[PDB]
Design a protein around this ligand. Structure first.
Ligand SMILES: CC(=O)N[C@@H]1[C@@H](O)[C@H](O[C@@H]2O[C@H](CO)[C@@H](O[C@@H]3O[C@H](CO[C@H]4O[C@H](CO)[C@@H](O)[C@H](O)[C@@H]4O)[C@@H](O)[C@H](O[C@H]4O[C@H](CO)[C@@H](O)[C@H](O)[C@@H]4O)[C@@H]3O)[C@H](O)[C@H]2NC(C)=O)[C@@H](CO[C@@H]2O[C@@H](C)[C@@H](O)[C@@H](O)[C@@H]2O)O[C@H]1O
Ligand SMILES: CC(=O)N[C@@H]1[C@@H](O)[C@H](O[C@@H]2O[C@H](CO)[C@@H](O[C@@H]3O[C@H](CO[C@H]4O[C@H](CO)[C@@H](O)[C@H](O)[C@@H]4O)[C@@H](O)[C@H](O[C@H]4O[C@H](CO)[C@@H](O)[C@H](O)[C@@H]4O)[C@@H]3O)[C@H](O)[C@H]2NC(C)=O)[C@@H](CO)O[C@H]1O
Ligand SMILES: C[C@@H]1O[C@@H](O)[C@@H](O)[C@H](O)[C@@H]1O
Ligand code: NI
Ligand code: NI
Lengths: 158, 158
Protein backbone atom coordinates (compact mmCIF):
# COMPACT_ATOMS: atom_id res chain seq x y z
CA UNK A 1 0.00 0.00 0.00
CA UNK A 2 1.37 3.42 -0.95
CA UNK A 3 0.14 6.83 -2.06
CA UNK A 4 1.10 9.67 -4.39
CA UNK A 5 0.01 13.21 -5.19
CA UNK A 6 -0.90 14.75 -8.50
CA UNK A 7 2.12 17.10 -8.13
CA UNK A 8 4.32 14.03 -8.11
CA UNK A 9 5.30 13.43 -4.53
CA UNK A 10 4.95 9.95 -3.04
CA UNK A 11 4.66 8.40 0.38
CA UNK A 12 6.03 4.83 0.20
CA UNK A 13 5.07 1.50 1.70
CA UNK A 14 5.14 1.84 5.46
CA UNK A 15 3.91 5.41 5.59
CA UNK A 16 5.48 8.81 6.05
CA UNK A 17 4.57 12.38 5.33
CA UNK A 18 4.13 14.73 2.39
CA UNK A 19 3.22 18.35 1.67
CA UNK A 20 0.26 19.11 -0.60
CA UNK A 21 -0.54 22.63 -1.99
CA UNK A 22 -4.18 23.44 -2.73
CA UNK A 23 -5.88 26.17 -4.74
CA UNK A 24 -8.48 28.13 -2.72
CA UNK A 25 -11.25 30.43 -3.86
CA UNK A 26 -9.63 33.84 -3.33
CA UNK A 27 -12.76 35.52 -1.84
CA UNK A 28 -15.24 33.83 0.58
CA UNK A 29 -18.07 35.46 2.56
CA UNK A 30 -19.78 34.47 5.77
CA UNK A 31 -22.32 31.79 4.81
CA UNK A 32 -20.22 30.46 1.92
CA UNK A 33 -17.93 27.46 1.97
CA UNK A 34 -14.39 27.04 0.68
CA UNK A 35 -14.33 23.55 -0.78
CA UNK A 36 -10.95 21.79 -0.62
CA UNK A 37 -11.34 18.48 -2.45
CA UNK A 38 -8.27 16.34 -1.95
CA UNK A 39 -9.62 13.44 -4.03
CA UNK A 40 -8.16 15.08 -7.12
CA UNK A 41 -4.74 15.29 -5.50
CA UNK A 42 -4.15 12.21 -3.26
CA UNK A 43 -4.22 8.67 -4.76
CA UNK A 44 -3.41 5.33 -3.21
CA UNK A 45 -3.29 1.68 -4.15
CA UNK A 46 -3.11 -1.84 -2.73
CA UNK A 47 0.06 -3.62 -3.78
CA UNK A 48 -1.15 -7.28 -3.33
CA UNK A 49 -4.92 -7.23 -3.86
CA UNK A 50 -5.25 -10.93 -4.68
CA UNK A 51 -4.14 -11.87 -1.16
CA UNK A 52 -4.51 -8.71 1.01
CA UNK A 53 -7.29 -6.27 1.73
CA UNK A 54 -6.16 -2.77 2.79
CA UNK A 55 -8.26 -0.63 5.16
CA UNK A 56 -7.91 3.12 5.12
CA UNK A 57 -9.35 5.71 7.52
CA UNK A 58 -9.19 9.40 8.10
CA UNK A 59 -7.60 9.02 11.52
CA UNK A 60 -7.64 12.74 12.26
CA UNK A 61 -7.99 16.09 10.62
CA UNK A 62 -6.58 19.19 12.26
CA UNK A 63 -6.72 22.88 11.43
CA UNK A 64 -3.84 25.31 11.45
CA UNK A 65 -3.14 28.95 10.91
CA UNK A 66 -5.84 31.00 9.38
CA UNK A 67 -8.17 28.05 9.01
CA UNK A 68 -7.91 27.34 12.73
CA UNK A 69 -8.40 31.00 13.61
CA UNK A 70 -10.97 32.19 11.01
CA UNK A 71 -13.08 29.23 9.83
CA UNK A 72 -15.33 26.47 11.06
CA UNK A 73 -15.42 23.30 9.04
CA UNK A 74 -16.68 19.92 8.10
CA UNK A 75 -14.93 17.07 6.37
CA UNK A 76 -16.52 14.65 3.98
CA UNK A 77 -14.95 11.21 3.91
CA UNK A 78 -16.29 8.58 1.49
CA UNK A 79 -19.76 9.99 1.44
CA UNK A 80 -20.20 10.77 5.14
CA UNK A 81 -19.77 14.18 6.82
CA UNK A 82 -18.02 14.96 10.11
CA UNK A 83 -16.80 17.97 12.07
CA UNK A 84 -13.46 19.46 11.13
CA UNK A 85 -11.27 19.49 13.19
CA UNK A 86 -12.28 15.92 13.66
CA UNK A 87 -13.58 14.29 16.83
CA UNK A 88 -12.83 10.58 16.09
CA UNK A 89 -11.30 8.26 13.45
CA UNK A 90 -13.74 7.56 10.59
CA UNK A 91 -14.95 4.21 9.36
CA UNK A 92 -12.70 2.46 6.89
CA UNK A 93 -12.52 2.51 3.11
CA UNK A 94 -11.37 -0.70 1.44
CA UNK A 95 -8.53 -0.55 -1.08
CA UNK A 96 -8.51 -3.71 -3.19
CA UNK A 97 -6.76 -2.84 -6.48
CA UNK A 98 -3.32 -1.96 -7.81
CA UNK A 99 -5.02 0.77 -9.80
CA UNK A 100 -4.79 4.14 -8.08
CA UNK A 101 -7.98 5.17 -6.39
CA UNK A 102 -8.52 8.69 -4.91
CA UNK A 103 -8.46 9.20 -1.16
CA UNK A 104 -12.03 10.52 -0.78
CA UNK A 105 -11.49 13.49 1.53
CA UNK A 106 -12.88 16.98 1.09
CA UNK A 107 -12.93 19.95 3.48
CA UNK A 108 -15.82 22.45 3.67
CA UNK A 109 -14.67 25.60 5.45
CA UNK A 110 -16.83 28.59 6.36
CA UNK A 111 -15.63 31.93 7.80
CA UNK A 112 -16.47 32.80 11.38
CA UNK A 113 -18.00 36.22 11.92
CA UNK A 114 -14.74 37.76 13.16
CA UNK A 115 -12.93 36.86 9.93
CA UNK A 116 -12.04 39.72 7.65
CA UNK A 117 -9.28 40.69 5.36
CA UNK A 118 -6.66 38.11 4.57
CA UNK A 119 -8.00 35.15 6.45
CA UNK A 120 -5.63 32.55 4.95
CA UNK A 121 -2.16 33.53 3.87
CA UNK A 122 -0.56 32.23 0.68
CA UNK A 123 1.94 29.47 1.36
CA UNK A 124 0.69 28.83 4.88
CA UNK A 125 -0.12 25.53 6.56
CA UNK A 126 -3.90 25.20 6.78
CA UNK A 127 -4.52 21.60 7.76
CA UNK A 128 -3.05 18.22 8.57
CA UNK A 129 -4.92 15.08 7.46
CA UNK A 130 -3.73 11.69 8.80
CA UNK A 131 -4.47 8.59 6.70
CA UNK A 132 -4.23 5.38 8.71
CA UNK A 133 -3.69 2.13 6.80
CA UNK A 134 -4.08 -1.38 8.14
CA UNK A 135 -4.91 -4.75 6.47
CA UNK A 136 -6.40 -8.19 6.97
CA UNK A 137 -3.05 -9.93 6.79
CA UNK A 138 -0.47 -8.92 9.44
CA UNK A 139 0.17 -6.31 12.12
CA UNK A 140 0.94 -3.38 9.79
CA UNK A 141 -0.51 -0.09 11.06
CA UNK A 142 0.90 2.88 9.22
CA UNK A 143 0.26 6.60 9.04
CA UNK A 144 0.41 8.72 5.88
CA UNK A 145 0.52 12.32 7.09
CA UNK A 146 -0.62 14.99 4.60
CA UNK A 147 0.34 18.59 5.41
CA UNK A 148 -2.03 20.87 3.46
CA UNK A 149 -0.79 24.29 2.38
CA UNK A 150 -2.60 27.16 0.70
CA UNK A 151 -1.35 28.28 -2.66
CA UNK A 152 -2.95 31.69 -2.46
CA UNK A 153 -4.41 34.26 -0.09
CA UNK A 154 -8.10 33.96 0.81
CA UNK A 155 -9.92 37.20 1.62
CA UNK A 156 -13.12 37.55 3.61
CA UNK A 157 -14.89 40.78 2.62
CA UNK A 158 -15.57 43.11 5.49
CA UNK B 1 -25.03 19.75 25.60
CA UNK B 2 -25.55 16.57 23.70
CA UNK B 3 -28.01 14.98 21.32
CA UNK B 4 -29.68 11.64 20.66
CA UNK B 5 -31.75 10.00 17.96
CA UNK B 6 -34.95 8.00 18.24
CA UNK B 7 -34.29 4.25 18.91
CA UNK B 8 -30.89 5.29 18.23
CA UNK B 9 -27.61 6.81 18.94
CA UNK B 10 -26.02 9.80 20.59
CA UNK B 11 -23.58 12.49 19.60
CA UNK B 12 -21.89 13.35 22.90
CA UNK B 13 -20.63 16.55 24.47
CA UNK B 14 -18.25 18.25 22.06
CA UNK B 15 -20.04 17.13 18.91
CA UNK B 16 -19.45 14.57 16.29
CA UNK B 17 -21.35 12.78 13.53
CA UNK B 18 -24.23 10.31 13.31
CA UNK B 19 -26.44 8.61 10.74
CA UNK B 20 -30.23 9.01 10.97
CA UNK B 21 -32.47 6.56 9.12
CA UNK B 22 -35.87 8.06 8.34
CA UNK B 23 -39.12 6.62 7.07
CA UNK B 24 -40.49 8.54 4.10
CA UNK B 25 -43.90 8.63 2.56
CA UNK B 26 -43.67 5.83 -0.06
CA UNK B 27 -45.75 7.46 -2.77
CA UNK B 28 -45.61 11.20 -3.55
CA UNK B 29 -47.35 12.47 -6.68
CA UNK B 30 -46.23 15.53 -8.60
CA UNK B 31 -47.86 18.36 -6.69
CA UNK B 32 -47.92 16.46 -3.33
CA UNK B 33 -45.44 17.14 -0.54
CA UNK B 34 -42.84 14.91 1.07
CA UNK B 35 -42.16 16.09 4.62
CA UNK B 36 -38.96 14.96 6.32
CA UNK B 37 -39.60 15.89 9.98
CA UNK B 38 -36.40 15.49 11.98
CA UNK B 39 -38.03 16.84 15.18
CA UNK B 40 -39.30 13.36 15.83
CA UNK B 41 -35.84 11.91 15.30
CA UNK B 42 -33.23 14.28 16.78
CA UNK B 43 -33.41 15.52 20.40
CA UNK B 44 -30.99 17.61 22.43
CA UNK B 45 -30.45 18.73 25.97
CA UNK B 46 -28.49 21.24 28.06
CA UNK B 47 -26.35 19.55 30.69
CA UNK B 48 -25.89 22.45 33.18
CA UNK B 49 -29.03 24.53 32.73
CA UNK B 50 -28.97 26.24 36.17
CA UNK B 51 -25.69 27.95 35.14
CA UNK B 52 -25.41 27.80 31.26
CA UNK B 53 -27.66 28.67 28.27
CA UNK B 54 -27.01 26.68 25.10
CA UNK B 55 -27.60 28.17 21.62
CA UNK B 56 -28.26 25.96 18.60
CA UNK B 57 -28.47 26.82 14.89
CA UNK B 58 -28.92 24.93 11.66
CA UNK B 59 -25.58 26.09 10.26
CA UNK B 60 -26.13 24.37 6.91
CA UNK B 61 -28.39 21.89 5.20
CA UNK B 62 -27.41 20.14 2.00
CA UNK B 63 -29.26 17.74 -0.32
CA UNK B 64 -27.99 14.48 -1.83
CA UNK B 65 -29.08 11.70 -4.09
CA UNK B 66 -32.63 11.64 -5.20
CA UNK B 67 -33.56 14.61 -3.02
CA UNK B 68 -30.93 16.74 -4.78
CA UNK B 69 -31.94 15.61 -8.23
CA UNK B 70 -35.70 14.95 -8.10
CA UNK B 71 -37.15 17.31 -5.43
CA UNK B 72 -37.25 21.01 -4.72
CA UNK B 73 -38.08 22.47 -1.35
CA UNK B 74 -37.48 24.45 1.80
CA UNK B 75 -36.32 23.87 5.34
CA UNK B 76 -38.28 25.00 8.33
CA UNK B 77 -36.35 25.72 11.51
CA UNK B 78 -38.27 26.67 14.67
CA UNK B 79 -41.23 27.99 12.81
CA UNK B 80 -39.55 29.93 10.04
CA UNK B 81 -38.89 28.68 6.51
CA UNK B 82 -35.68 29.06 4.53
CA UNK B 83 -34.32 27.82 1.21
CA UNK B 84 -33.08 24.22 1.03
CA UNK B 85 -30.18 23.61 0.28
CA UNK B 86 -29.51 26.44 2.70
CA UNK B 87 -27.77 29.74 1.94
CA UNK B 88 -27.21 31.08 5.46
CA UNK B 89 -27.09 29.96 9.06
CA UNK B 90 -30.39 30.26 10.88
CA UNK B 91 -31.30 32.16 14.02
CA UNK B 92 -30.54 30.49 17.30
CA UNK B 93 -32.76 28.20 19.31
CA UNK B 94 -32.19 28.15 23.08
CA UNK B 95 -31.77 24.88 25.00
CA UNK B 96 -32.22 25.31 28.78
CA UNK B 97 -33.32 21.95 30.32
CA UNK B 98 -31.76 18.49 30.82
CA UNK B 99 -35.03 17.08 29.43
CA UNK B 100 -34.66 16.03 25.80
CA UNK B 101 -36.15 18.65 23.48
CA UNK B 102 -36.61 18.18 19.69
CA UNK B 103 -34.33 19.83 17.17
CA UNK B 104 -37.05 21.65 15.20
CA UNK B 105 -35.90 20.96 11.63
CA UNK B 106 -38.15 19.68 8.86
CA UNK B 107 -37.66 19.44 5.11
CA UNK B 108 -40.64 20.28 2.87
CA UNK B 109 -39.95 18.71 -0.53
CA UNK B 110 -42.03 18.40 -3.67
CA UNK B 111 -41.14 16.42 -6.83
CA UNK B 112 -39.85 18.23 -9.85
CA UNK B 113 -42.26 18.11 -12.75
CA UNK B 114 -40.23 15.59 -14.76
CA UNK B 115 -39.85 13.13 -11.88
CA UNK B 116 -41.44 9.73 -12.14
CA UNK B 117 -40.80 6.28 -10.83
CA UNK B 118 -38.27 5.67 -8.10
CA UNK B 119 -37.22 9.18 -7.04
CA UNK B 120 -35.47 8.31 -3.76
CA UNK B 121 -33.65 4.94 -3.75
CA UNK B 122 -34.00 3.07 -0.37
CA UNK B 123 -30.90 3.31 1.95
CA UNK B 124 -29.51 6.33 0.10
CA UNK B 125 -28.17 9.52 1.61
CA UNK B 126 -30.73 12.29 1.25
CA UNK B 127 -29.40 15.20 3.32
CA UNK B 128 -26.68 16.43 5.64
CA UNK B 129 -27.78 18.80 8.42
CA UNK B 130 -25.21 20.62 10.54
CA UNK B 131 -26.25 21.58 13.99
CA UNK B 132 -24.02 24.25 15.58
CA UNK B 133 -23.96 24.61 19.36
CA UNK B 134 -22.50 27.47 21.36
CA UNK B 135 -23.34 28.89 24.79
CA UNK B 136 -23.25 31.98 27.05
CA UNK B 137 -20.57 30.56 29.29
CA UNK B 138 -17.27 29.76 27.58
CA UNK B 139 -15.85 29.61 24.07
CA UNK B 140 -17.36 26.23 23.04
CA UNK B 141 -18.39 26.02 19.37
CA UNK B 142 -19.29 22.49 18.42
CA UNK B 143 -20.77 20.82 15.34
CA UNK B 144 -23.18 17.91 15.45
CA UNK B 145 -23.34 16.52 11.92
CA UNK B 146 -26.45 14.50 10.92
CA UNK B 147 -26.22 12.31 7.83
CA UNK B 148 -29.82 11.58 6.86
CA UNK B 149 -30.72 8.41 4.96
CA UNK B 150 -33.99 7.17 3.47
CA UNK B 151 -35.17 3.89 4.92
CA UNK B 152 -37.41 3.21 1.93
CA UNK B 153 -37.96 3.95 -1.74
CA UNK B 154 -40.14 6.96 -2.55
CA UNK B 155 -42.04 6.65 -5.84
CA UNK B 156 -43.55 9.50 -7.83
CA UNK B 157 -46.49 7.88 -9.68
CA UNK B 158 -46.97 8.62 -13.36
C1 LIG C 1 -21.24 30.40 41.38
C2 LIG C 1 -20.38 29.96 40.25
O1 LIG C 1 -20.73 30.07 39.07
N1 LIG C 1 -19.21 29.42 40.59
C3 LIG C 1 -18.25 28.94 39.62
C4 LIG C 1 -18.50 27.47 39.32
O2 LIG C 1 -19.78 27.32 38.72
C5 LIG C 1 -17.43 26.93 38.39
O3 LIG C 1 -17.62 25.52 38.35
C6 LIG C 1 -17.90 25.24 36.89
O4 LIG C 1 -19.22 25.24 36.54
C7 LIG C 1 -19.49 24.92 35.17
C8 LIG C 1 -21.00 24.97 35.00
O5 LIG C 1 -21.48 26.27 34.71
C9 LIG C 1 -18.92 23.56 34.82
O6 LIG C 1 -18.92 23.54 33.40
C10 LIG C 1 -19.28 22.39 32.76
O7 LIG C 1 -18.12 21.58 32.75
C11 LIG C 1 -18.33 20.29 32.11
C12 LIG C 1 -17.01 19.45 32.22
O8 LIG C 1 -16.58 19.45 33.59
C13 LIG C 1 -15.61 18.40 33.72
O9 LIG C 1 -14.51 18.63 32.96
C14 LIG C 1 -13.78 19.84 33.23
C15 LIG C 1 -12.72 19.84 32.16
O10 LIG C 1 -13.35 19.34 31.01
C16 LIG C 1 -13.29 19.80 34.68
O11 LIG C 1 -12.62 21.04 35.04
C17 LIG C 1 -14.50 19.64 35.64
O12 LIG C 1 -14.09 19.64 36.99
C18 LIG C 1 -15.35 18.39 35.26
O13 LIG C 1 -14.58 17.26 35.58
C19 LIG C 1 -18.72 20.51 30.68
O14 LIG C 1 -19.17 19.25 30.13
C20 LIG C 1 -19.89 21.46 30.55
O15 LIG C 1 -20.07 21.76 29.18
C21 LIG C 1 -20.93 20.97 28.37
O16 LIG C 1 -22.24 21.31 28.76
C22 LIG C 1 -22.62 22.66 28.51
C23 LIG C 1 -24.10 22.79 28.95
O17 LIG C 1 -24.96 22.07 28.05
C24 LIG C 1 -22.34 23.03 27.06
O18 LIG C 1 -22.67 24.41 27.02
C25 LIG C 1 -20.96 22.79 26.70
O19 LIG C 1 -20.69 23.15 25.41
C26 LIG C 1 -20.64 21.31 27.01
O20 LIG C 1 -21.49 20.49 26.18
C27 LIG C 1 -19.61 22.74 31.34
O21 LIG C 1 -18.45 23.26 30.73
C28 LIG C 1 -17.50 23.38 35.33
O22 LIG C 1 -17.17 22.00 35.25
C29 LIG C 1 -17.36 23.86 36.77
N2 LIG C 1 -15.97 23.79 37.17
C30 LIG C 1 -15.58 23.25 38.33
C31 LIG C 1 -14.11 23.21 38.57
O23 LIG C 1 -16.39 22.81 39.15
C32 LIG C 1 -16.03 27.33 38.86
C33 LIG C 1 -14.95 27.09 37.81
O24 LIG C 1 -15.18 27.79 36.59
C34 LIG C 1 -14.54 26.88 35.54
O25 LIG C 1 -13.30 27.51 35.80
C35 LIG C 1 -13.17 28.88 35.37
C36 LIG C 1 -11.77 29.37 35.82
C37 LIG C 1 -13.49 29.03 33.87
O26 LIG C 1 -12.52 28.35 32.99
C38 LIG C 1 -14.87 28.44 33.57
O27 LIG C 1 -15.01 28.46 32.15
C39 LIG C 1 -14.98 26.98 34.09
O28 LIG C 1 -16.32 26.47 33.95
O29 LIG C 1 -15.96 28.73 39.16
C40 LIG C 1 -16.86 29.13 40.13
O30 LIG C 1 -16.70 30.47 40.47
C1 LIG D 1 0.11 -19.62 -2.45
C2 LIG D 1 0.82 -18.51 -1.73
O1 LIG D 1 0.95 -17.39 -2.22
N1 LIG D 1 1.31 -18.81 -0.51
C3 LIG D 1 2.01 -17.89 0.37
C4 LIG D 1 2.83 -16.87 -0.43
O2 LIG D 1 1.98 -15.97 -1.15
C5 LIG D 1 3.68 -16.02 0.50
O3 LIG D 1 4.43 -15.08 -0.26
C6 LIG D 1 3.89 -13.77 0.01
O4 LIG D 1 2.73 -13.12 -0.43
C7 LIG D 1 2.46 -11.91 0.29
C8 LIG D 1 1.21 -11.33 -0.32
O5 LIG D 1 0.05 -11.87 0.27
C9 LIG D 1 3.62 -10.92 0.21
O6 LIG D 1 3.33 -9.86 1.14
C10 LIG D 1 3.79 -8.61 0.78
O7 LIG D 1 5.25 -8.53 0.94
C11 LIG D 1 5.74 -7.25 0.44
C12 LIG D 1 7.22 -7.23 0.54
O8 LIG D 1 7.66 -8.35 -0.18
C13 LIG D 1 8.97 -8.07 -0.81
O9 LIG D 1 9.69 -8.17 0.41
C14 LIG D 1 9.63 -9.45 1.08
C15 LIG D 1 10.40 -9.31 2.39
O10 LIG D 1 10.14 -8.01 2.94
C16 LIG D 1 10.22 -10.50 0.12
O11 LIG D 1 10.13 -11.79 0.69
C17 LIG D 1 9.47 -10.51 -1.23
O12 LIG D 1 10.04 -11.52 -2.11
C18 LIG D 1 9.43 -9.10 -1.86
O13 LIG D 1 10.79 -8.81 -2.25
C19 LIG D 1 5.11 -6.13 1.30
O14 LIG D 1 5.56 -4.86 0.78
C20 LIG D 1 3.57 -6.22 1.24
O15 LIG D 1 2.97 -5.34 2.11
C21 LIG D 1 2.69 -4.09 1.65
O16 LIG D 1 1.50 -4.17 0.82
C22 LIG D 1 0.26 -4.57 1.43
C23 LIG D 1 -0.80 -4.55 0.34
O17 LIG D 1 -1.03 -3.24 -0.08
C24 LIG D 1 -0.04 -3.66 2.61
O18 LIG D 1 -1.09 -4.26 3.30
C25 LIG D 1 1.20 -3.62 3.53
O19 LIG D 1 0.84 -2.77 4.63
C26 LIG D 1 2.42 -3.18 2.82
O20 LIG D 1 2.15 -1.82 2.35
C27 LIG D 1 3.06 -7.63 1.63
O21 LIG D 1 3.42 -7.79 3.03
C28 LIG D 1 4.97 -11.57 0.48
O22 LIG D 1 6.04 -10.80 -0.04
C29 LIG D 1 5.09 -12.90 -0.25
N2 LIG D 1 6.33 -13.56 0.14
C30 LIG D 1 7.17 -14.11 -0.74
C31 LIG D 1 8.40 -14.72 -0.15
O23 LIG D 1 6.95 -14.11 -1.95
C32 LIG D 1 4.58 -16.94 1.32
C33 LIG D 1 5.46 -16.19 2.30
O24 LIG D 1 4.95 -16.20 3.63
O25 LIG D 1 3.74 -17.80 2.10
C34 LIG D 1 2.92 -18.70 1.32
O26 LIG D 1 2.08 -19.40 2.18
C1 LIG E 1 -2.15 -18.99 -0.25
C2 LIG E 1 -1.33 -18.34 -1.36
O1 LIG E 1 -0.64 -17.24 -0.76
C3 LIG E 1 0.22 -16.53 -1.62
C4 LIG E 1 -0.52 -15.97 -2.82
O2 LIG E 1 0.34 -15.20 -3.71
C5 LIG E 1 -1.27 -17.09 -3.54
O3 LIG E 1 -2.14 -16.52 -4.50
C6 LIG E 1 -2.16 -17.85 -2.55
O4 LIG E 1 -3.17 -16.99 -2.09
NI1 NI F 1 2.78 -0.10 -5.57
NI1 NI G 1 -26.51 14.98 29.33
Amino acid sequence: FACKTANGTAIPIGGGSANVYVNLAPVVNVGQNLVVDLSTQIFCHNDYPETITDYVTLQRGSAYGGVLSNFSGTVKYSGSSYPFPTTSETPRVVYNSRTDKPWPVALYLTPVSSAGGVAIKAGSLIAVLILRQTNNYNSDDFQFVWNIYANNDVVVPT
